Amino acid sequence: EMQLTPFLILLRKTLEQLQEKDTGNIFSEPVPLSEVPDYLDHIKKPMDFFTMKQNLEAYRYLNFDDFEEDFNLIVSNCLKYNAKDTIFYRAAVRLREQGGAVLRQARRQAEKM
Numbered sequence: 871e872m873q874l875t876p877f878l879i880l881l882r883k884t885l886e887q888l889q890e891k892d893t894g895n896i897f898s899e900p901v902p903l904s905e906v907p908d909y910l911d912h913i914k915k916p917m918d919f920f921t922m923k924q925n926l927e928a929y930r931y932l933n934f935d936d937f938e939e940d941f942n943l944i945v946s947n948c949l950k951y952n953a954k955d956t957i958f959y960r961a962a963v964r965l966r967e968q969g970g971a972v973l974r975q976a977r978r979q980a981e982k983m
């Protein structure tokens with residue numbers, strides 16, 4: 871219920887802030903299915919920040935919830951696949967915490983559009 875171009879500006883900036891939290895660059899490109907062959911036996915919808923960028927620029931996020939849903943998939947897929955005592959699981963918890971705060975801030979800025 872606002873103009874497209876500003877909303878997308880906000881989502882691009884939000885996506886950059888989320889990517890900045892992935893300091894190890896483990897969430898920034900699809901999981902390499904060539905290196906992890908059992909990945910899709912548990913993960914129904916892989917997600918990553920590059921795919922989110924592509925979706926954003928294809929006009930596939932037209933509300934904040936659709937954007938936040940794909941972010942949440944990045945986190946939940948990693949929590950699902952990895953044991954708790956791993957760097958990967960711990961990284962997803964960190965991203966959930968740090969990324970959640972980025973998202974709330976961005977949602978506020980959207981309410982004003």
Ligand SMILES: Cc1[nH]c(-c2csc(N=C(N)N)n2)c2c1C(=O)CC(C)(C)C2
Nearest residue numbers: 896897901902905906909948951952958
């Ligand atoms: C979020 C995430 N990112 C990656 C990744 C990026 S790059 C790369 N290269 C490799 N040779 N494994 N793995 C992984 C992951 C997991 O959840 C666990 C995992 C074993 C599927 C591996």
